[PDB]
Amino acid sequence: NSVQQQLEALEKSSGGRLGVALINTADNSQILYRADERFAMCSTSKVMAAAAVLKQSESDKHLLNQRVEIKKSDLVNYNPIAEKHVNGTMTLAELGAAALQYSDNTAMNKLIAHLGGPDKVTAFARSLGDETFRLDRTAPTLNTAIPGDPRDTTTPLAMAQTLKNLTLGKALAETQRAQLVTWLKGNTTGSASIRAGLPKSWVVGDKTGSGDYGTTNDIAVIWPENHAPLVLVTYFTQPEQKAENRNDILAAAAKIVTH
Ligand SMILES: CC(=O)OCC1=C(C(=O)O)N2C(=O)[C@@H](NC(=O)Cc3cccs3)[C@H]2SC1
Ligand SMILES: *C(=O)[C@@H](NC(=O)Cc1cccs1)[C@@H]1N=C(C(=O)O)C(=C)CS1
Ligand SMILES: O=C(O)Cc1cccs1
């Protein structure tokens, strides 16, 4: 059975809608599955917000060390790092790290607020040539992931192209690119997702998302030992609002497209 047939079968048995875009940077070849369909990004959108702040830092050498005050009233539904810092400060760099490596929603909201709102994240994506990405809401509501809702969505192909540019391409100056990569490589939330479908010793940087409608996402850059990098987006969503998340489906998709 072909890769396409395998993805079709995985999707059908899983009881959802699967979106996959793999870019092989060895030859610029692609494996696409529903790659032009919109999906709710959920917390994968934090990559774009963190990168937007990194872009700003290219013209302000003091930005990443700027103090941000964390109040009790800033806490939302999931904030394992920010809650440790209530009544204190975190730097913008520390907020980027917390957002990316722990999926701290308070940290995401501080990045968005610093930028001037969700629309500023959209404008940053557009500045990278991504005509597809849109950020409309803050956390937690950006994770509602309602079928057919365009808010806070992108397509697998658009996100793969932009993640490639961010991490391996033209988007950021070198120090900032390297910082983004360091953050992604140190993610703690992705064990059971794309990483689980790959050789254990491959280096991976990724950002997950989990939302309503059992929406389960991961976007990754993958560094094989003897090959050029791969960029992989796996998005998955289901028909029932209260559905369980399905990290294993992302692992399976990763295994299929790297087999
Ligand atoms: C850490 C995490 O939450 O993993 C997602 C998950 C997955 C997955 O795909 O990774 N799922 C499974 O493999 C499903 N588990 C079951 O269907 C087992 C059952 C439990 C209760 C009745 S059936 C769901 S249970 C939830
Ligand atoms: C990002 O996806 C974010 N998800 C949520 O806050 C969950 C919801 C909020 C409203 C409806 S559902 C955080 N990300 C992680 C992750 O990266 O997977 C989570 C596991 C949940 S918190
Ligand atoms: O407590 C407040 O309302 C303001 C803050 C100062 C420092 C962290 S939060």
- C-alpha pair distances (Å), 70 with each of 32, 82, 130, 181, 203: 41, 7, 32, 26, 33
CB 236 within 8 Å of CB 246 = yes
Query: What does R_g of the chain's alpha carbons equal in angstroms?
Result: 17
Q: Does residue 172 line the site of ligand 2, with CB under 6 A?
A: no
CATH of domain 1-259: 3.40.710.10
CB 227 within 8 Å of CB 29 = no
Resolution in Å, one decimal place: 1.1
Instruction: Calculate how far, in angstroms, residue 194's C-alpha sits from the geometric centre of ligand 2.
Output: 17
Class of residue 244 by CB neighbours under 10 A (exposed 0-12, middle 13-18, buried 19+) = exposed
Report which ligand 1 atom has the smallest distance to the Cα of 245.
5
| CA–CA gap between residue 203 and residue 77 (Å, rounded) | 31
CB neighbours of residue 27 within 10 Å: 8
- Kindly give, in sequence order, each residue whose CB lies less than 8 Å from that of residue 185, ignoring residues fewer than 6 positions away: 203, 204, 205
Instruction: Calculate how far, in angstroms, residue 24's C-alpha sits from the geometric centre of ligand 2.
Output: 28
Q: Which residues are annotated as a binding site for substrate?
A: 207-209
Q: Name which of 220, 214, 168 is nearest 190 in CA terms.
A: 220
Tell me how far apart the 2 most distant CA atoms of the chain are, in Å: 57
Ligand with an atom nearest the CA of residue 73: 3
Q: Which two tokens stand for residue 89?
A: 């400060």
CB 206 within 8 Å of CB 194 = yes
Q: Which residue puts its alpha carbon closest to atom 4 of ligand 3?
A: 71
| CA–CA gap between residue 83 and residue 62 (Å, rounded) | 25
Q: Which amino acid is at 160?
A: A
Probe target for ligand 1 pocket from 14, 188, 236, 246, with the most ligand atoms within 8 Å of CB: 246
Q: Which residues are catalytic?
A: 43
The structural domains of the chain, with segments of one domain joined by +, span: 1-259
| CA–CA gap between residue 177 and residue 159 (Å, rounded) | 16
| CA–CA gap between residue 68 and residue 121 (Å, rounded) | 19
Ligand with an atom nearest the CA of residue 189: 2
Q: Which residue puts its alpha carbon closest to atom 7 of ligand 2?
A: 211
**Between 105-115 and 46-57, two packed helices, what is the crossing angle to 10 degrees?**
50
Report which ligand 2 atom has the smallest distance to the Cα of 211.
12
| CA–CA gap between residue 45 and residue 100 (Å, rounded) | 10
| CA–CA gap between residue 80 and residue 239 (Å, rounded) | 29
| CA–CA gap between residue 53 and residue 140 (Å, rounded) | 20
The three-state (H, E, C) secondary structure of the chain, written as one string: CCHHHHHHHHHHHHCCEEEEEEEECCCCEEEEECCCCCEECHHHHHHHHHHHHHHHHCCCCCCCCCEEECCHHHCCCCCCCHHHHCCCEEEHHHHHHHHHHHCCHHHHHHHHHHHCCHHHHHHHHHHCCCCCCCCCCCCCHHHCCCCCCCCCEECHHHHHHHHHHHHHCCCCCHHHHHHHHHHHHCCCCCCCCHHHHCCCCCEEEEEEEEECCCEEEEEEEEECCCCCCEEEEEEEECCCCCCCCCHHHHHHHHHHHCC
Instruction: Calculate how far, in angstroms, residue 95's C-alpha sits from the geometric centre of ligand 2.
Output: 16
Q: Which residues are annotated as a binding site?
A: 207-209
Task: Give the chain's length.
Answer: 259
| CA–CA gap between residue 158 and residue 231 (Å, rounded) | 12
Report which ligand 2 atom has the smallest distance to the Cα of 207.
17
Report which ligand 1 atom has the smallest distance to the Cα of 247.
10
Instruction: Calculate how far, in angstroms, residue 69's C-alpha sits from the geometric centre of ligand 3.
Output: 6
| CA–CA gap between residue 126 and residue 156 (Å, rounded) | 16
| CA–CA gap between residue 159 and residue 34 (Å, rounded) | 13
| CA–CA gap between residue 156 and residue 139 (Å, rounded) | 21
| CA–CA gap between residue 65 and residue 79 (Å, rounded) | 21
CB 49 within 8 Å of CB 122 = no
